[PDB]
Amino acid sequence: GQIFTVQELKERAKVFAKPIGASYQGILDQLDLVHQAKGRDQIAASFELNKKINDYIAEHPTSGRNQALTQLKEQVTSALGL
Amino acid sequence: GQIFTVQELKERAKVFAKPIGASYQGILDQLDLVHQAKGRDQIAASFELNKKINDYIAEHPTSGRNQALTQLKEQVTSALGLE
Numbered sequence: 692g693q694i695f696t697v698q699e700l701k702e703r704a705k706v707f708a709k710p711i712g713a714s715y716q717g718i719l720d721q722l723d724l725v726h727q728a729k730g731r732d733q734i735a736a737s738f739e740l741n742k743k744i745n746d747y748i749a750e751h752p753t754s755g756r757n758q759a760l761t762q763l764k765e766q767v768t769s770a771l772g773l
Numbered sequence: 774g775q776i777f778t779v780q781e782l783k784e785r786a787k788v789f790a791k792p793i794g795a796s797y798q799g800i801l802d803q804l805d806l807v808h809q810a811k812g813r814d815q816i817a818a819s820f821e822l823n824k825k826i827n828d829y830i831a832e833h834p835t836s837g838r839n840q841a842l843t844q845l846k847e848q849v850t851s852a853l854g855l856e
């Protein structure tokens with residue numbers, strides 16, 4: 692219908708969450724590398740971890756869930772009037 | 774050492790995520806009420822859904838994960854002497 696069902700809301704949130712999760716996994720992988728490294732290697736790994744976090748925060752400020760919720764509100768607002 | 778391990782990061786994300794997940798469940802439950810209601814009951818339920826969404830977006834702008842990552846960044850920047 693006009694307003695998402697719970698299942699439709701969840702499936703929309705998933706679509707948006709998919710690329711964010713992929714980016715997050717790359718951060719996790721880099722974090723392990725930092726802890727497994729020592730000396731100059733650890734310094735290098737840490738700088739790259741910093742960039743990955745920066746890049747993630749810039750590209751993914753809003754969760755998949757929150758993006759879908761914003762769309763749900765508009766559906767509800769329209770179903771009610773404004 | 775001075776920065777989270779992957780396990781510690783996941784643990785911290787989960788703590789922050791817990792209240793957000795609870796508010797979200799409230800929205801999900803109210804959305805089911807909207808679809809289960811007929812006529813006048815559906816209108817009332819929709820107003821309350823809108824309020825719940827509105828309150829959530831004000832209360833929970835940043836995911837548990839993102840809150841934990843922001844703390845991680847600060848640890849890493851501190852460790853490397855960056856601002």
Ligand SMILES: [Br-]
Binds near residue numbers: 711836838839
């Ligand atoms: Br997220």
Ligand SMILES: [Br-]
Binds near residue numbers: 754756757793835837
């Ligand atoms: Br979230």
Ligand SMILES: [Cl-]
Binds near residue numbers: 711754
């Ligand atoms: Cl997400």
Ligand SMILES: [Cl-]
Binds near residue numbers: 789837
């Ligand atoms: Cl969350």
